[PDB]
Amino acid sequence: RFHSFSFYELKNVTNNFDERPISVGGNKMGEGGFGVVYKGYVNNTTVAVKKLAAITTEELKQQFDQEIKVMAKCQHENLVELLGFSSDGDDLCLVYVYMPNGSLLDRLSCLDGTPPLSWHMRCKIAQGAANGINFLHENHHIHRDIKSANILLDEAFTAKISDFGLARASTVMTSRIVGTTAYMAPEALRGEITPKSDIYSFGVVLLEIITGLPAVDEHREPQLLLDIKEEIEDEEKTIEDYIDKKMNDADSTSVEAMYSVASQCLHEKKNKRPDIKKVQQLLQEMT
Numbered sequence: 710r711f712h713s714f715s716f717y718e719l720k721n722v723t724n725n726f727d728e729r730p731i732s733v734g735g736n737k738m739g740e741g742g743f744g745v746v747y748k749g750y751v752n753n754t755t756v757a758v759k760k761l762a763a764i765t766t767e768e769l770k771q772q773f774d775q776e777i778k779v780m781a782k783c784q785h786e787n788l789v790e791l792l793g794f795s796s797d798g799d800d801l802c803l804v805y806v807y808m809p810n811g812s813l814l815d816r817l818s819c820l821d822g823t824p825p826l827s828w829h830m831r832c833k834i835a836q837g838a839a840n841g842i843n844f845l846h847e848n849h850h851i852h853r854d855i856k857s858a859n860i861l862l863d864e865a866f867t868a869k870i871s872d873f874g875l876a877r878a879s880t881v882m883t884s885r886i887v888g889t890t891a892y893m894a895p896e897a898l899r900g901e902i903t904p905k906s907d908i909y910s911f912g913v914v915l916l917e918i919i920t921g922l923p924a925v926d927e928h929r930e931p932q933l934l935l936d937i938k939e940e941i942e943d944e945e946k947t948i949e950d951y952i953d954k955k956m957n958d959a960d961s962t963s964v965e966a967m968y969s970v971a972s973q974c975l976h977e978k979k980n981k982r983p984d985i986k987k988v989q990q991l992l993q994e995m996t
Contacts, residue, residue, distance in 0.1 A: 711777070712793030716800045719758050722749040726760060732821075741859075742872045743772060748807070756792060757808070761801040773801045776874025783848060787841030789861055789871040808869050810862030813838075813914070817857060817921050817953075825955035830866060831918045832963065836992045837868030842911060843985040846904050850876040853902070855910035856892045856924065857917050879904050891925035891933060896979055905979040908988065912974025915967060921953030938975060966995040 720726060726747055729735025736747040744759040763769055773796070780791035795802035810816060813834060816826055826834070838860050845852055853875055861869040875887060881902040888897055894909035913924050916934050924934045931937060940946040948968045952959055970991045976982050983991070 711781070711791060712804065714793050714795040714802065714804060715797050716795050716802065718751070719749065719760075719795050719802050719804070722751045722756075723747040723758050726758075742776070742803075742874060743769070744803075749804070751804075755807040755809075757805040759803045759805070761803070766799070769801060770796075772874060773803070776803065779850065779873050779876050783845065783850065783873070783876075785841060785844040787837045787868050787870055788844060789869045805871075806863075806869075808861035808863050808871075810864070810866055812858045813860040813862060813868070814857035814917070814923065816862060816866075817917055818923065819955070825921075825953075826866075828956045828959035828963070831956075832967070832992075832996050834860070834862070834866060834868045835915060835918055835967065836989070836996070838870060838914065839911070839985065839989045839992050841868060841870035842907060843989055845870070845873070845876065846879070846907070846985045849879045851879050851902060851904050852876055852907045852910075853897075854888050854892075855907045855914065856889050857914050858889075860914065877902055889924075891923075891935070894979065895977060901979075903979060904985075905982050908974050908982045908985060909979070911985075911988065912971045912982075915971035915974065919948065919953065919964065919968060919971070920951045921955055922951075935975075938972070963995050967992070970995070 723736045727735040728737050728745065730737050731748060738746045738748055738757060742759055744761040747758045749756045749758045761769055761773055777794060790806040791803060792806060793804045816823060819825055852873055854872055859872045861871050863869055883900045883902060886900055892910045892913045894906040897906040913934065917924060922934055925932055937951065941948055948964065952964055970988060973983050
């Protein structure tokens with residue numbers, strides 16, 4: 710099933726949860742899913758260890774319990790795999806398969822000097838992520854935080870959708886709004902919970918893959934990649950003026966095919982957006 714770790718094991722294998730970034734000599738890889746993520750090395754295997762931090766306690770155990778329940782049921786090549794967990798004490802940890810190529814956001818940004826992703830590889834990554842989302846939707850889960858920074862990349866650059874648990878079952882309303890603003894559908898930003906909002910957010914990821922630009926850049930005009938989309942519709946701009954210049958293999962025809970899928974995903978009216986299945990068909994027809 711899952712591996713039951715005890716906290717002392719995870720502490721030993723993460724340099725006692727060394728919170729400096731890995732660049733600096735520590736074990737921290739990021740923060741999210743209600744915790745800090747650290748690199749560990751256990752039994753000849755590199756792992757990612759998420760140590761949950763307290764919203765409040767008591768609801769934390771419920772969320773940890775729920776994330777495990779979701780992962781037990783959600784096994785797929787385009788989803789991050791949970792390996793085990795630690796629950797002894799006031800301390801809660803989740804242990805995942807390690808993804809050596811980091812996030813799609815970081816690779817689109819060539820963080821740390823990694824080479825630019827080719828157009829052909831971007832197309833594969835887009836299809837992989839759509840496959841992961843389709844598995845989630847088929848199994849009545851809503852991700853709620855679809856973004857490039859949550860699409861991880863293994864040894865082969867296979868797309869791995871991460872950070873659910875918070876993955877609700879499947880129009881509900883909520884007082885505690887979650888997600889990442891620059892990626893959120895307008896109805897999600899008002900608190901409607903629906904798988905159609907994951908589609909919208911996936912439209913945004915597609916624009917990041919096309920253009921190489923982050924969804925938000927506060928030193929850019931416009932700060933929001935979403936707006937750049939309205940420029941193309943309303944302002945004599947073309948997607949071609951926006952194609953990532955860090956590629957040498959992006960043909961006009963498939964670029965436009967992906968942009969058209971992005972544009973369908975991005976309808977403001979949730980009911981006009983394609984479903985994940987259609988998005989897969991489209992992304993497949995694209996290659």
